[PDB]
Amino acid sequence: DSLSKEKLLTNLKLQQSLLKGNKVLMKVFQETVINAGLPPSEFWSTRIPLLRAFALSTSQKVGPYNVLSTIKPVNKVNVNLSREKILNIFENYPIVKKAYTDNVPKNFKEPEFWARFFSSKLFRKLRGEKIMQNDRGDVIIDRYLTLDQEFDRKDDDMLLHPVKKIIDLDGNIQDDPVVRGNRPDFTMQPGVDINGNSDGTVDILKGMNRLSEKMIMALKNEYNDERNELKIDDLNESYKTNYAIIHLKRNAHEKTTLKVSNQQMLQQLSLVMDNLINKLDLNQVVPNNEVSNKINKRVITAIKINAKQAKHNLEVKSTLPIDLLESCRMLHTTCCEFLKHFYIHFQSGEQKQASTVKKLYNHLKDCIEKLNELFQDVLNGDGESMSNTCTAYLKPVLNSITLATHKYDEYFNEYNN
Template identity: 30%
Template sequence: MMALTTAGTTTGGSDLWSEARLAEDMALQMSLLKSDSALSNTFKEAVMSGSVTSEQFWSTRIHLLRAHALEKSQIRGPYNVLAAVRSTTVDGVARISLSREQIADIFSQHPLVKIVYDENVPRVSEDQFWSRFFLSRLFKKLKGDKLLQTDPTDTLFDRYLNRDDEDNSRKRRRIDYVPLTIDLAGNEQNITKGRGNAPDMTMRPSRVENTPIIRTLNSLSHKLVDLVAPADPNRDEDQDEHYIQEQRLADLGGDMEEERIILNIQDQRNFFSNEQDDGGKGQNKFAGMDATVALEGMIRDLGTNHFDISDILPNEEDEDMEDMDGTATARKTSFHLATKQVTEAVRDRTSQMISVGAAGTASSLFATTGGLPREVFESVQSVHATTNEFLHHFWLAFLSGDEKRAKDINSMVSSLRKSKDRIEAVAITAEEQKEVERVKRKRDLHEEYKKTGIKPKKKDMEVGGGRKVVDEMLAPTLVAIEKALVKYESALDEAEKLAAAA
């Protein structure tokens, strides 16, 4: 991510994740389709059938492309490769397996090893070089381990023990500007060396022999940080104010003056005139209701019996709100229908969760698929996703008001009509599969009756799935299709009438 930020900053990066660039990146789109099977099925049904163009399909999924691009661009950061190397014992002999990537990381993090390698290979074979290196004291020093008197010596690598790996390290990243608020070198004259407080205990080695180890570990940490690309290489002097604001103690400052607009009101009683003159109709209608009793009743009704939220609302029939054209009645009817749908959905979802939690895997699968076979249920999911795709693009084009998109609207209408046929085909397949399952269940129960002599019960003959389940699952989708087609036909009739009048 930090490398991408650098690349974006240096190459005009604001359009690195722009909509136009993501919409044209076919390799990224194919990668996303391979990683998401559901999206791939929708793409095949909607785009490859010719109902929706590829541009239309991806225009509504720019956020998915951007998230996938960010996910792919993330790379693994540097790590201490010497500490990650592990040896294995085979036939009593310690063996170490190194990859070319690990060797390259060793050379990058420890340039001294590369110098030793260049000076001694191929005079010493490469296999022998690495086997001797991982047993040498030089390896322990670079790794940060403490050297002991009992460590084996090696004439090849011991010659480089006193050479500092820091002198041969990679070129440090050059920072052109350091804000004065954090520039330790620029404020060196303010740092006491010969006098003042001693360093903290955590900054002082307990023993003199530990000092080289601490320096080695600090040097290695410094190299790993240097291998990371800078997050903001174009930092300018305007950042000084930013650092100053961060270090400022806001609690010590005074309160900010509030800028208010003064309103001069002569008589405030006019604000309450509506509530005083409405004959008491504006009073709280729920003032006499016990909240605890009402809440307990609502929970009990939602969990067991049919519940209509309008039952606890005040009766509007007693209020004089009926219009001459019946607007209030229509509004009340719509409210009751919406309430019924919401409460039924809550109750169905609650019963599904209870059955899944109580019965285990088989019941969970049945509650998820409604008794449909897996392949039929996948067909239901596919036709649902494809139809939603058509509906989405239909409303985008229909509500745009652009006459140039009339062709797209006609194409989407044709696809929506075909979607009704697809739903009907899935329902027929579900009914056929249900009949096959019923015959199989009847045959199995008959065989069991011959073996045990126990007559099967009527409920054992019941089989789930079928057209009824498909119709229930896709009923909202069919309603959405019908509404879109009705709106289209209405707009088309109105356009024809205007054209005839003109």
């Protein structure tokens, strides 16, 4: 289905679809392929989960439901039609879909059609309403009555299937074919009208049963056992988890990249217990104001250093021209995209990746030179008034990029040379 990497890369229409959904994706994609000419497959190669998420979001569909039962008759009536529910009616009733498609594009209007439909007795029949000759219906819609009837016959023919003997009430009533007793009660048998005909409640009940069967066979779509069926689980062994416990052997390496004696510590301990019981003065704790002044110097130095650390506690406010700010952000973004794709190629590790690595190396070099030329532009646009800040802002991505270039050169010298 539409789930492989090849399928997701193939769906150019879906790619354009979420392209048109976003705006920074036009920005990024335009710079990536319209401006830089990157292979758009490798563009989308990162965004594969996003593509699949968009596809699966677009791909779901609802389950069937009794749309005619949700239809209410609502003096006068005003049509308040919902197109999704109109298509729901179409899907649930292909007869109604057909009656739409041979009359509205031929004879009259859609709201006129639906007014005729709500007027029609075919609507009442298809809904849970007993038909009545007092009702006149709509003649145009009610011409489809026998067509819907033969649809019902064909659908019932489809719905017929053999039954399991474990639950077969037909086999149950065919237990004794020579039962000769008495005629059962009118109460508990299906009653009829005065002239022997039925009222049709059996028809409406078999119709709603047909609706249920159509439901469940819509569920039963494309998208022996009695031994298991008759198991009595209540007298069986309880399930126990096979979860594995874990122990932990403990032997850690010592930290890598004079010794005191009991006599000497005991001597000092005796002496300091003697000093402890001897004396203790709070007043002697006051310092000499000179070594204390050096303490003041050290403390104040630490305060100054950490205060300058705290002095640099939406992005930050900047005094850039907004266009050059956007241009440099754009350049940073496409350089980051290039760098990530180059790392993807490099960490992949194949000889098939070699030309890709070389070409992305060329692109990184081009980005470097374009960064330098941008620095020349902000040079002769500022006189290095705040072109220094431009260079420093674009610095760390450039450092990482050129570090990657050095890594590529080093591995080239490692393998080839």
